[PDB]
Structure 1
Amino acid sequence: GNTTSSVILTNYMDTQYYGEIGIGTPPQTFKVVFDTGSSNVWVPSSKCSRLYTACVYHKLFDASDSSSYKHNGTELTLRYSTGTVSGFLSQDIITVGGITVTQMFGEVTEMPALPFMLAEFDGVVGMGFIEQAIGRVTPIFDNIISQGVLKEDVFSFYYNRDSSLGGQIVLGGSDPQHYEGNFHYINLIKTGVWQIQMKGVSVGSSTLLCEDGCLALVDTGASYISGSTSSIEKLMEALGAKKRLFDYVVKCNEGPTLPDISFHLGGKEYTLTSADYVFQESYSSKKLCTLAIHAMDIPPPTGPTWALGATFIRKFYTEFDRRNNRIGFALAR
């Protein structure tokens, strides 16, 4: 086709990026995170029990208000790293940017306040592949492509830094106003996960980590750049970061002193400077600053793997190419 659809995102604290979708006729509007690490669509239910606060605190779909809903009941449990959610299939019209599409989505009838009570958004739009879809339900993007319509079989993510639009997704292309120069692509290790091969992680001038290769999931639904507990321990130790109770911290004044961290992908070096990975809330010698890199031991089959989340995307605008099973990166602007 010859269209593109974009969704303006809200950037909450550099940790949550979400946009609007409407579900049903007329549409009921929800805030969703668009997640490449998963493939299901889900929102909180009409029918959610109001005990778990999450539902009491989220917008709930009311199928009784949809002129276009179509009953489905097949039950679902959606398991992510942070948590799990349960509900059941439903069939309705979803508006995304300027596109309307019929979609099987999950009606979230069980939704735990950990982490759900921390979510500034209502639900999730999985931008992952069918192979990861609970219920082997056709993922929204796939459904949108069926539609002809989009110019290219691709979708792009822009995440801004918290200070402006908070971010933007473009379905069917990329927006040149938000990147510099040209994309360089890295091919997926295999169809089914948005995961590529990584040939090294350098601290400053030196390959400290992943010397003999590793995996990197490009995850729009993850806040930080993460690696296993061991990798991160090693990385932090190279940075001189210490763990302050819950997290790794640095003296805020010495943040501008930390080395660059480079990620070797597709034969290039994707470099983040300390300003790109240190939360410089402050610059005092009297305060401790947090880092936007965390350990995350991801289970196989997917893991162990590094996850390149918002911290990475902020630096590199990203294009997910379905057609060619590759990811394109360009300097965000």
Structure 2
Amino acid sequence: SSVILTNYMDTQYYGEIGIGTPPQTFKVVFDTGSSNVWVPSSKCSRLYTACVYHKLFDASDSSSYKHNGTELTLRYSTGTVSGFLSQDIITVGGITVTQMFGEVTEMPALPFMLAEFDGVVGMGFIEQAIGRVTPIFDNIISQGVLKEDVFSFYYNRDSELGGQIVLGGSDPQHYEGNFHYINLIKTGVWQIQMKGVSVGSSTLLCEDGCLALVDTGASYISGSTSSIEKLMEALGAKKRLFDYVVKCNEGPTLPDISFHLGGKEYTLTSADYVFQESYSSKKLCTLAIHAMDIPPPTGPTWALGATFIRKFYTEFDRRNNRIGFALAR
């Protein structure tokens, strides 16, 4: 089963799932960086403007809904949502599973007013599930219908299909060459060891090694503030409140950036990481890379998000506890 994804500005990739009976539609990001499922709730006060601008789950319109009520707070690197737990049937690309999910009643305008998606479907491990709720993928695995204990991500470059997630395998039409796998530094987190990061001809970063969280829910590639400051000075990039920019006319000639993963160098060109919207020396162009200090136990760690995934098709293998990469097509 595959879910078609929409690509919003190269920063938000989301697909649709249906919840309840009849099905209530929601746009959601499939996030390997988290393990809970949640969507805005009809019980979310309208004083939360984000709830006025998104699809709301209304339990009182679903006959398959099962009440629970346990409070839960989900905090991401760029924001937090709070609400309570509920159960209902969820449809994900043809597959139907009874799932426990969060009904969000507190959804801060910043950043959710800037969210094209409604909610999130965590593709992480139960170990990181808040409230210890069984993740949706584990519930699908329990059904014994998927040919493989794996799911795959394809994120296209902007245009005008925005992307695609395959549950139970990979789609050969979206990658070439063969996968190369890196075992997880531990079960319960889609994090792998990274042997180094090079900018131009000089492995000036992550010498001695570091961690790499492969996060489908992260828009960019991130590193600790320290690491990023060093990466950016090398790029001649200037820091702003939320990001790093470079004079657009300089964009095209910025050096490659490679990530040493499992004995293979994964390289991105400036075209892969700079939002080239002009060539004017008078304008600033943002880079799809920035600081993000991920707290323990996960971090300190780098995060390989959409910027990385656009170039490398990614397969998350639950059975063998590893991640595989292949050149996206």
TM-score by length of 1: 0.97
The CA deviation at 1:285 is 3.2
CA distance in 1, matches of 2:159, 2:201: 30
Deviation, 1:76, is: 0.7
Q: CA deviation at 1:254?
A: 1.9
Instruction: Identify the residue that residue 272 of structure 2 maps to in structure 1.
Output: 276
Kindly tell me: are residues 51 and 264 of structure 1, through their superposed partners in 2, closer, same or farther at Cα, counting changes over 3 Å?
A: same
How far apart are 1:174 and its partner, in Å? 0.7
3-state secondary structure, aligned to 1:212: coil
Instruction: Indicate how the Cα distance of structure 1 residues 131 and 245 shifts in structure 2: closer, same or farther if over 3 A, else same.
Output: closer
Change (3 A) 1:247 1:79: closer
CA distance change for structure 1 residues 164 and 155 in 2, over 3 Å: closer, same or farther?
farther
What's the Cα RMSD here?
A: 1.0
Q: Which residue of 2 aligns with 1:34?
A: 30
Which of 69, 89, 94 pairs up with 1:93?
Answer: 89
Q: Distance in 2 between matches of 1:194 and 1:177?
A: 24
Looking at structure 1, the residues matched to 128 and 231 of structure 2 have their Cα atoms a distance apart, in angstroms, of: 30
For residues 312 and 70 of structure 1, do their structure 2 counterparts lie closer, same or farther at Cα, with a shift above 3 Å needed? same
**Residue 54 of structure 1: CA displacement?**
1.1
Aligned length, in residue pairs: 329
Report 1:213-252 matches (<5 A). 213-244=209-240, 246-252=242-248
* 1:288-308, Cα deviation, whole Å (9 max, x unpaired): 211100100111111111000
1:112-131 counterparts in 2 under 5 A?
Answer: 112-131=108-127
Alpha carbons of structure 1 residues 245 and 100: separation in structure 2 relative to 1, 3 Å: closer
Deviation by residue 1:286-333 (Cα, 9 ceiling, x = unmatched)? 322111001001111111110000000001010000001100000111
Which residue among 167, 170, 175 is the counterpart of 1:171? 167
Deviation at 1:204, TM superposition (A): 1.6
Shift of 1:63: 0.8
Per-residue Cα deviation, 1:125-183 (whole angstroms, up to 9, x for no partner): 00000000011111000000000001100000000111260000000011011111110
Residues 311-326 of structure 1 mapped to structure 2, 5 A cutoff: 311-326=307-322
Distance in 2 between residues matched to 1:216 and 1:244, nearest whole Å: 24
Shift of 1:244: 4.6
Cα offset, 1:120, TM superposition: 0.4
| Consecutive unaligned residues in structure 2, runs of 5 or more | none
Structure 1 distance, partners of 2:234, 2:302, is 17
Query: 2:146 matched to 1:150?
Result: yes
Equivalent position SS for 2:203: strand
Residue 62 (structure 2) aligns with: 66
- Three-state SS of the structure 2 residue aligned to 1:209 is coil
Instruction: Name the CA distance, whole Å, in 2 between partners of 1:158 and 1:204.
Output: 27
TM, length-normalised to structure 2: 0.98
Question: After superposition, what is the alpha-carbon deviation per residue over 1:203-243, rounded to whole angstroms, capped at 9, x for unaligned?
Answer: 12210100010001000000000101110110011111122
Q: Give 1:10's match in structure 2, choosing from 6, 9, 14.
A: 6
Structure 1 runs (4+) deviating above 4 angstroms are none
CA separation of 1:332/1:164 partners in 2, compared to 1, >3 Å: closer, same or farther?
farther
Q: Quote the Cα distance in structure 2 between the aligned partners of 1:184 and 1:216.
A: 16
Rounded to whole Å, the distance in 2 between the matches of 1:28 and 1:102 is 14
